[PDB]
Nucleic acid binder design. Structure first.
Ligand SMILES: [Zn+2]
Ligand SMILES: [Zn+2]
Ligand SMILES: [Zn+2]
Ligand SMILES: [Zn+2]
Lengths: 680, 1291
RNA sequence: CGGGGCAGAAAAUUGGAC
RNA sequence: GGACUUAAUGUCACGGUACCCAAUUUUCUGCCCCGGA
């Protein structure tokens, strides 16, 4: 009708303006909504009718719709899948239309092919390779080779060439066209002419350009997919390609969002695993010099440390965000806006101080752990300061996980009575990693600093049992310390006062001898300490104990709060509030599982409040790994009050905590203590 | 070797799924999800029949689980024979995986064995498990099985093995709700069967080793659940609906032909309510007829459906059918008509998600749990009843989409909102809703929890899931099977304050007072304290309210239940397990336990006496009690109240246009519906008033849309993303027993603006509740507030309450004429102390009243010159006409930038006016409720007798008459359009060209839309698409001597009027050659003495029945009323004040008998207030005289600017209203000539009959004969005499 | 020589959010 | 007695609240004078 053409011409302005990246996504979503709602009403008004030319527009607008519906998801969006699935149905009917025009059929087939490419990208069981191959062949048959004006033809040609269809007759115009990026040129060079120099140069240019692209961009996804394809073909370029891409990613990640932030795209774990594998493989060679091998092992440790630093979170958590006055109001909003704009950009237009790994005090041994997911392997890299040497080993972790899960499940039901499975877990730990008890790996009589990985953070590594008839414990011959990451170690000189503080808040008077000692400080709030009462210590004391409860949060680490006689002080609040605990020693009463949530997968990057205390400036924390009785905590507090010049492993050993064979409850109650922090 | 046959019985609805092969099962998500249900297979291609069964592998799984639990409870022994740990693992190499791959924990114990189980000897556990047999993963002969489980088949023992799926199953939809926001997502659907008819299955079990018979039998007796319901295991038509759909299509076609299509929802889904009446109403035709001419009025029941009317109708069709029944007939007719009409008239986010089954290497683990030796296990049962304290609602989907077996499309949803019932039309509480509510309350009481995940490779270990894995419930049904009622709901446009487009829907709700059975079972070691806290929160006792919220629509207060008659018992599973097995755990016999004495309980079941009371549990004191806070208050209404109800008004036989709202309440005692209905105000209006007040206060109502908005309203009252944090309830009348007549009959009419007569099709009446200033109504209600509110939000709520108290927002409808005005609010004494302190703080402080300087009775100082023709004749010689016409214009000014109602503009005033009324001549206000009030319709029949208008014996004046009088005066003053007019009419002599609407000027036609523009009268008082800005109230009687007492034959407080009838438009327009003159007005005089003296033989066989008798009021009476306005300009207020009191020696007319000199009143202003709304929350104050005079002067300036003259200069000129021509002409009509000592009593009478009259006196020959011919009076002279006030007709 | 009119009309019956 | 209709050393589906947003209301004086077989 004469109304149909005018309506289509009016509504096409809004749909063609969608190729303008200037508009913010918050307005892009509403303008595309209007441009889609003007057209969809015609469907329910003119059911079983239309000119078959505005029918393709329903699918074309729907293709651009699944650009803003993708976010606000955790691991996979349920509406991005629906949008393409629905746009397929509204183009299948346009295909069956008998208009017979050449350009209209070409455009309809182009839209169908690109929608099917996206569907196959996000879903394989609903769109196999054979159907995509047939559809792309049909699209090529109609003459969809206008490479000089539309990048959709370039994408179609690249996808067809990656499948196994020879395309020698279009390579010249594919290369000549200026609307092709570096990755497309590299793919064309590699998959057609089997050349290597041009592919290396082009993808090197692409990787260099990638340094200024946020992680929300799809270019990272295409790059990782291409590198995976190269690895699958057993090529040689992937070893350097992975390392260069990892370097670019590490450079780009340093944006300093609240000093600890990420975006959680689907990749960035397989990329790190692939870089680790490439470095290890290129270090496995028999080079005539050992300095290059030492450099390679140091690079492996560097990669592990760079991965272990921060943690990622999802939009559901970074939206439902507790707020403060300084950082949460500005940095979080800026990061959110930057990430969203980056996500909705490439779909419109295509174009303290860190220390040194070798700076440790004499007589110290450092162990780095890494769990490889791409190959299901374990690693352990050690560095000896006196000998200036590096080593590495391997192990399997497929049954240690099951034993740990069994221990956790039994403990969650019978707290004390689950002490029999702790011995089994410790024995399994000792058997799985025998290099700990080897003189050629860790010399006996030294100090060990542990930097574990995801699910190894919850294992009592200091209570391992050697695999023999009369095996002994690890802490008997050594003295262990823990650290979530090497980036948390900072230079610190002990220049503090000599006062003691107390902060007690419990349900029953389990601590009666405590809170009545003469040595306690005058700023103690032993009768119901509150959230702002902790903020009243500013003289840098030497000891501080906080006897209270804890509240666990399952999704947001920033929402876990320390239970006090108030609304409670949270992770963000404890970072933004306490300013007077620098260089001191802290002791917590009894909690390590009241804050971290239970885990179901092999990975976990959650953090407790001990890391928060380490961040404000504390020089060390002492806590109990699981729930115990108040007698042991009170005895430890009194011992720490009496003296501070003695080690913790000596106290554990002299209390008869190494009698796991005789009384498992004694072992359970004794080996629950560990020390956090690195004495610099 | 033996063969035992067993049967299985269900006590709750169970679930059904379609049968697929194991290889082909991976294609269907529903088949993968429902792997533990009963299976259904078709019989033939393209069929709707089949048969159902239960596989023996599932029964085997349940039996071995029961065996494991029984062995665990007894430290791995049974009857003194020890058992081993068995085996539950297989190797992928040297074999193949089993078909189901367990994903839960396994109870284990100490071995305490000396012989390894082998082919020569095995424990009963290793015998029940097919360990050492000749049958593996491939079935070959069925004989090698040492123990075999066969399939279980449905018992169709009666007849007709050809069973249809539609007669056994039904469809339903469930969903998942997010804890933080309250919204839902990822729904899914299933099938539900009927356990009352098809609930028995028979199967066979074969066992060949006599070393496990006792264990197998005990395990069979220990199984409690299967296929989603509690189970027990023992060892031995087209014509009707087709014809009705055809008739519905016929009715739809007839309605479309008659051009009445939107009216189809007034027949359909409104005659559906006849199911609450019965067949008696149609069997006697007691429907409320239509009068409309007293001959054949329709009142909804006279249509054009290609035959006889809709009254010679279903009275002849119920007899035809008589088969489905009254209820089914009405319901199916209504549903078919509604569906047809909806079909005739009429993007993303659907997200129906099913949980997937994972498959990956290293994702299967064996986790054993070893409980401590010496621990004890128990089993607690809780019984009681759930009582509904408020109407409830459990939602379902349209029955057309719920057919089990069947199913390029976008969103299109219905509006009926059905309710969940069973096959016998009884009310039901599903187990899923109860489980969801219990889980939510448990998570709230614990303080922490998790959002449920559906993948589930390892089960969650949080605080809530651990307890929820031990809780079992039951499905509940009632004993009441009567049809539910229907609630209507609309929305208002904030701009024009009227009904918005696309804003109508209805819901079905149940009665309040019903009771349902309640069962809860917990198994474990120790009874938790959080569960006790939840139970105590749900219970009600000794001034405490139950706090159980179930179902949807919690924001409008639907579905608050209460728990009573609680009994708690306890089993002991370490020494009383044989008794538990023998009694089957009382599965299916819970009502007997609810109604059983203590001595009759079986062995093993003992009462539990350790249930903690309130105030002793740490939970429920820091978490549950401060969750919701209650505010209660009483509202006093001193005016008639009407919340309109249309379907009831057109259904009950009272034959009334509009009636009040009422509901049905169920009575627990004697199990019946209480036949006295209760009047109330719906909670939707209660919520809407508060929401609108808050939005207008904070200015968030003006936003265009709230798609992702997060304004203050979206925070307090919620939006489409997050639920609401405030919940309202009903306001119920409590003093209805103090009125001898609770409802009053009031009539209304519309008056034509040209002829002064009642318009056609403009008569209507209302039936509101009776309220008076000295005897007001009482309403009591409440609402709940969630914790976490800031001080600003509490201040806003308190300000809204104060605004409601002051009287800004009336309740109900017709609030612009004095209905539903609030007098005061009395807050209860149990509300929080801070709320009362804030109410006291925000209460209106002492206003800035003028210190009695110029704050007295504001009296205008103005003198009109008056007409001079009667001034020079003090001998009373001339004769004048009763009425004259006023002509002005025609030049009407219209405005396009009309003022919206959603903001208190800073430069606009808003206050109230108080005024008094004094009468000069006798006043008559008839009361048409009773046509025989004086009780004299005996010996004299056909003579109507009224009295004075009153409520509860208090003389009053309705606000409608005052509003109409001042509206007409303002229209005359401001030369606005004709609001009321008779568009179509014809004139005949003793055959005109056009109708009476054709001669009217184009500009004077009434406004019909908001685009062209609104004249000042319509822009100020209101239109059909624009709510007015002024309000009027009722006037009460204060003082006065008495009635007009006479001395005759009738009662002394009465009088007999004359003949008044039939105004004649065809008198001012001779024949097709003149236009209408304009508005018509009467004159003030003292002609009421002629009626009084001619009484007593005015009745003596002269007027048989054409006269009426009514009470009268004497001179010197005083009435007082109020006027409200808001968002007014300056000159508008000046004009309003000027029109309310033009000045001295000028009065108004009001009442019946105007052309006889009756009903002349004078109005004076007593005071004036104005409240200012700013950021600092200013208060009310009294304005002095200077600003009032400034307002009047500004109004004069605006009027003279509107005049358009430029010769007259503008400035600070004293107000002389006689300069403007039309204003002076209008003021000449209202001049009182007998006020001061200038009596000058004139003589105004209608012309008498020609020669055979009664009061005709000789002389001037004033009859119509002389002045009716074009020889003594030309037409132009007659028009000039009509259009000139105080023109004598004496010559 | 005669005579009663009106006992309702006009609009909104679903939109979105998932 | 049996197929239609199961497979066996492994079924947390009592693992999921049909859930969230909307004022049956806007406008209207129970009034009154000339006639036509
Ligand atoms: Zn055995
Ligand atoms: Zn959980
Ligand atoms: Zn809002
Ligand atoms: Zn108007």
């Amino acid at each position: 009708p004469t109304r149909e053409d005018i309506d289509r011409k009016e509504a096409e302005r809004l749909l063609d303006e969608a190729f303008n990246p200037r508009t913010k996504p918050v307005d892009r979503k509403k303008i595309i909504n209007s441009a889609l709602k003007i057209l969809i009403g015609l469907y329910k008004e003119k059911k079983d009718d239309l000119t078959s030319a505005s029918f393709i527009s329903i699918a074309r607008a729907y293709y651009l719709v699944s650009i803003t519906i993708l976010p606000k998801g955790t691991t996979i969006p349920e509406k991005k899948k629906e949008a393409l699935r629905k746009g397929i149905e509204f183009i299948d009917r346009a295909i069956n239309k008998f208009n017979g025009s050449i350009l209209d059929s070409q455009r309809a087939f182009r839209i169908k092919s690109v929608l099917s490419i996206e569907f196959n990208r996000i879903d394989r069981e609903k769109c196999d390779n054979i159907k995509l191959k047939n559809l792309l062949n049909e699209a090529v048959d109609k003459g969809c080779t206008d490479f000089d004006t539309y990048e959709w033809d370039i994408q179609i040609a690249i996808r067809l060439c990656e499948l196994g269809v020879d395309m020698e007759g279009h390579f010249d115009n594919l290369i000549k066209s200026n609307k092709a990026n570096d990755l497309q040129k590299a793919k064309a060079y590699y998959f057609i002419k089997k050349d290597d120099h041009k592919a290396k140069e082009h993808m090197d240019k692409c990787t260099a350009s990638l340094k200024y692209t946020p992680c929300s961009h799809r270019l990272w996804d295409e790059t990782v997919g291409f590198i995976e394809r190269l690895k699958g073909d057993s090529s040689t370029l992937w070893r350097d390609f992975a390392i260069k891409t990892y370097r670019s990613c590490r450079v780009q990640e340093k944006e300093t969002g609240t000093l600890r932030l990420r975006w959680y795209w689907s990749r960035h774990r397989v990329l790190y695993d692939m870089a680790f594998l490439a470095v290890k493989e290129q270090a496995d060679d028999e080079e005539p010099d050992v300095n290059v091998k030492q450099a390679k092992i140091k690079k492996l440790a560097e990669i592990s440390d760079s991965l272990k630093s921060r943690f990622s979170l999802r939009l559901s958590d970074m939206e439902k965000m507790p707020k403060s006055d300084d950082e949460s109001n500005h940095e979080f909003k800026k990061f959110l806006d930057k990430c969203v704009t980056a996500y909705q950009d490439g779909y419109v237009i295509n174009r303290a101080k860190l220390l040194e790994l070798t700076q440790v005090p004499e007589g110290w041994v450092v162990v780095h752990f890494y769990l490889n997911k791409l190959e299901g392997m374990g690693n352990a890299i050690v560095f000896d300061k006196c000998a200036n040497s590096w080593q590495y080993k391997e192990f399997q972790y497929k049954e240690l996980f099951e034993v740990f899960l069994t221990w956790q499940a039994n403990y969650n039901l019978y707290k004390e009575n689950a002490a029999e499975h702790l011995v089994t877990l410790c024995k399994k730990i000792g058997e799985t990693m025998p290099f700990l008890f080897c003189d050629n790996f860790i010399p006996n009589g030294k100090d060990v600093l542990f930097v574990p990985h995801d699910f190894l953070h919850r294992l009592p590594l200091h209570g391992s049992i050697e695999n023999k008839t009369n095996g002994k414990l690890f802490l008997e011959n050594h003295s262990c310390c823990y650290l979530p990451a090497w980036s948390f170690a900072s230079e610190k000189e002990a220049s503090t006062s000599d006062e003691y503080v107390l902060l007690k808040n419990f349900d029953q008077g389990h601590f009666e001898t405590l809170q009545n000692n003469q040595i306690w400080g005058t700023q103690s709030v032993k009768d119901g300490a509150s959230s702002d009462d902790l903020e009243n210590i500013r003289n840098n004391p030497r000891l501080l104990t906080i006897l209270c409860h804890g509240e666990a949060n399952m999704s947001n680490p920033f929402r876990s709060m320390l239970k006090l006689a108030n609304g409670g002080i949270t992770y963000l609040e404890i970072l933004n509030s306490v300013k007077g605990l620098k260089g001191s020693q802290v002791i917590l009463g009894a909690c390590e599982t009241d804050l971290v949530p239970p885990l179901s997968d092999v990975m976990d990057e959650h953090y407790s409040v001990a890391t928060a205390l380490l961040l404000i400036g504390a020089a060390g924390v002492v806590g109990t790994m699981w729930k115990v009785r108040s007698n042991k905590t009170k005895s430890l507090i009194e011992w720490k009050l009496e003296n501070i010049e003695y080690k913790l492993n000596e106290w554990q050993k002299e209390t008869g905590g190494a009698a796991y064979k005789d009384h498992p409850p004694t072992f359970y109650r004794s080996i629950a203590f560990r020390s956090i922090g690195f004495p610099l | 070797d033996m063969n035992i046959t067993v049967e299985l019985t269900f006590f709750e609805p169970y679930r059904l799924v379609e049968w697929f092969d194991w290889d082909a099962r991976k294609k269907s998500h529903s088949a993968m999800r429902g792997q533990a249900f009963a299976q259904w297979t078709w019989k033939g291609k393209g069929r709707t029949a089949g048969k159902s069964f239960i596989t023996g592998t599932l029964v085997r799984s349940a039996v071995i689980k029961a065996v494991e639990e029984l062995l665990s409870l007894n430290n791995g022994k049974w009857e003194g024979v020890p058992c081993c740990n068995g085996s539950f693992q297989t190797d992928e190499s040297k074999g193949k995986k089993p078909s189901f791959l367990r994903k839960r924990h396994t109870l284990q114990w100490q071995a305490n064995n000396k012989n390894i189980c082998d082919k020569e000897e095995a424990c009963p556990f290793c015998i029940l498990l097919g360990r050492f047999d000749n049958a593996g993963k491939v079935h070959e002969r069925n004989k090698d099985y040492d123990i075999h489980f066969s399939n279980f088949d449905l018992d169709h023992k009666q007849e007709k093995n050809d069973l249809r799926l539609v007669d056994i199953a039904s469809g339903r939809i469930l969903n998942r709700v997010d804890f933080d926001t309250g919204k839902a997502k990822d729904y899914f659907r299933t099938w539900e069967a009927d356990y009352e008819t098809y609930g028995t299955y028979t199967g066979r079990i074969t066992l060949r080793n006599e070393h496990a018979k006792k264990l197998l039998l005990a395990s069979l007796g220990f199984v409690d659940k299967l296929c989603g319901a509690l189970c027990r295991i023992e060892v031995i038509s087209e014509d009707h609906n087709d014809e009705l759909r055809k008739q519905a299509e016929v009715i739809v076609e007839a309605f479309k032909q008659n051009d009445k299509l939107e009216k189809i929802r007034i027949l359909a889904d409104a005659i559906r309510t006849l199911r609450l009446h019965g067949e008696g109403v149609i069997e006697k035709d007691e429907l409320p007829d239509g009068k409309e001419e007293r001959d054949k009025g329709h009142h909804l029941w006279d249509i054009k459906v290609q035959g006889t009317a809709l009254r010679t109708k279903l009275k002849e069709l119920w007899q035809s059918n008589k088969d489905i029944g009254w209820r089914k007939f009405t319901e199916m007719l209504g549903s078919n008509l509604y569906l047809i009409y909806k079909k005739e008239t009429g993007i993303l986010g659907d997200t129906e998600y099913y949980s997937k089954a994972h498959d990956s290497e290293g994702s299967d683990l064996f986790i054993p749990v070893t409980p401590p030796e010496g621990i004890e296990t128990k089993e607690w049962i809780i019984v009681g009843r759930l009582k509904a304290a408020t109407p409830f609602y459990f939602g379902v989907q349209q029955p057309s989409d719920s057919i089990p077996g069947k199913e390029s499309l976008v969103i299109n949803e219905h509006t009926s909102f059905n309710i969940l019932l069973d096959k016998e039309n009884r009310y039901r509480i599903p187990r899923s809703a109860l489980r969801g509510a219990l889980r939510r309350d448990l998570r709230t009481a614990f303080g922490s929890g998790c959002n449920v995940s559906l993948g589930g490779q390892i089960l969650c270990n949080c605080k809530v899931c651990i307890e929820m894995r031990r809780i079992t419930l039951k499905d509940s049904v009632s004993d009441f099977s009567e049809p539910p009622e229907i609630r209507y709901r609309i929305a208002k446009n904030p701009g024009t304050a009227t009904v918005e487009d696309g804003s109508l829907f209805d819901i079905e709700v149940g009665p309040e007072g019903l009771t349902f059975p309640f069962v809860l079972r917990y198994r474990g070691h120790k009874f938790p304290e959080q569960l006790s806290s939840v139970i105590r929160y749900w219970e009600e006792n000794d001034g405490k309210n139950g706090m159980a919220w179930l179902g949807g629509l919690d924001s409008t207060g639907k579905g608050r239940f209460a728990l009573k008659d609680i009994k708690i018992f306890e089993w002991d599973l370490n020494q009383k397990i044989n008794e538990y097995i023998k009694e089957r755990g009382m599965r299916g016999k819970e009502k007997e336990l609810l109604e059983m004495g203590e001595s009759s309980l079986p062995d093993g079941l003992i009462p539990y006496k350790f249930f903690e009371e309130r105030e002793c549990l740490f939970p429920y004191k820091e978490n549950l009690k401060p969750q919701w806070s209650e505010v209660q208050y009483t509202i006093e209404v001193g005016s008639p109240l009407l919340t309109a109800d249309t379907i009831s008004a057109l259904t009950e036989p009272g034959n009334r246009d509009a009636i009040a709202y009422k509901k049905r309440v169920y009575n627990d005692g004697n199990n019946a519906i209480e036949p006295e209905p209760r009047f109330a105000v719906k909670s939707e209006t209660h919520r809407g008033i508060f929401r609108t007040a808050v939005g207008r206060r904070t200015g968030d109502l003006g936003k265009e849309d709230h798609e992702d908005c997060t304004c203050d309203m979206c925070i307090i009252f919620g939006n489409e993303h997050e639920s609401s944090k405030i919940r309202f309830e009903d306001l119920e009348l409590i003093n209805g027993n103090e009125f001898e007549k609770l409802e009053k009959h009031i009539d209304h009419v519309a008056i034509d603006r040209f002829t002064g007569g009642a318009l056609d099709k403009a008569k209507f009446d209302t039936y509101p509740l009776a309220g008076s200033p000295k005897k007001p109504l009482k309403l009591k209600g409440r609402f709940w507030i969630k914790k976490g509110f800031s001080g600003d939000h509490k201040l806003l709520i308190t300000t809204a309450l104060s605004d409601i108290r002051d009287g800004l927002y009336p309740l109900g409808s017709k609030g612009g004429v004095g209905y539903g005005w609030v007098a005061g609010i009395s807050i209860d004494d149990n509300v929080p102390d801070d709320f009362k302190e804030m109410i006291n703080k925000t209460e209106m402080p002492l206003p800035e009243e003028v210190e009695e300087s110029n704050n007295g009775p504001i009296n205008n100082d103005y003198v009109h010159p008056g007409h001079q023709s009667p001034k020079q004749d003090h001998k009373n010689k001339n004769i004048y006409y009763p009425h004259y016409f006023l002509d002005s214009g025609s030049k009407v000014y219209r405005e396009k930038d009309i003022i919206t109602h959603e903001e208190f503009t800073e430069e606009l005033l808003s206050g109230k006016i108080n005024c008094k009324l004094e009468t000069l001549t006798p006043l008559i206000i008839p009361d048409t409720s009773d046509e025989n009030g004086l009780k004299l319709q005996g010996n004299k029949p056909g003579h109507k007798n009224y009295k004075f208008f009153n409520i509860n014996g208090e003389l009053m004046i309705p606000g409608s008459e005052l509003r109409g009088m001042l509206r007409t005066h303002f229209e005359a003053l401001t030369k606005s359009c004709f609001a009321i007019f008779g568009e179509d009419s014809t004139l005949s002599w003793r055959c005109a060209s056009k109708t009476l609407g054709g001669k009217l000027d184009k500009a004077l036609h009434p406004c019909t839309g908001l685009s062209d523009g609104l004249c000042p009268g319509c822009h100020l008082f209101g239109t059909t698409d624009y709510k007015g800005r002024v309000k009027f109230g009722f006037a009460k009687y204060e003082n006065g001597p008495e009635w007009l007492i006479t001395r005759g034959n009738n009662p002394e407080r009465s009088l007999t009027l004359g003949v008044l009838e039939s105004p004649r438009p065809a008198f001012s327009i001779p024949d097709d050659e003149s236009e209408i003159p304009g508005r018509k007005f009467y004159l003030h005089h003292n002609g009421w003495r002629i009626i009084r003296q001619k009484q007593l033989e005015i009745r003596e066989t002269v007027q048989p029945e054409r006269n009426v008798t009514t009470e009268v009021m004497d001179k010197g009476n005083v009435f007082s009323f109020d006027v409200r306005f808001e968002n007014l300009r300056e000159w508008e207020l000046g004009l309003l004040l000027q029109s309310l009191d033009p000045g001295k020696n000028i009065a108004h007319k009001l009442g019946k008998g105007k052309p006889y000199g009756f009903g002349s009143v004078k109005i004076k202003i007593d005071s004036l207030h104005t409240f200012k709304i700013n950021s600092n929350n200013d208060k009310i104050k009294r304005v002095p005289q200077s600003d009032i005079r400034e307002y009047i002067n500004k109004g004069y300036q605006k009027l003279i600017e509107w005049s358009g003259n430029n010769s007259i200069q503008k400035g600070n000129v004293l107000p002389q209203w006689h300069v403007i021509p039309h204003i002076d002409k209008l003021y000449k009509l209202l001049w009182v000539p007998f006020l001061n000592d200038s009596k000058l009593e004139p003589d105004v009478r209608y012309p008498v009959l020609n020669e055979e009259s009664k009061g005709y006196i000789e002389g001037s020959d004033y009859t119509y004969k002389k002045l009716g011919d074009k020889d003594n009076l030309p037409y132009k002279t007659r028009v000039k005499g009509l259009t000139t006030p105080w023109s004598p007709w004496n010559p």
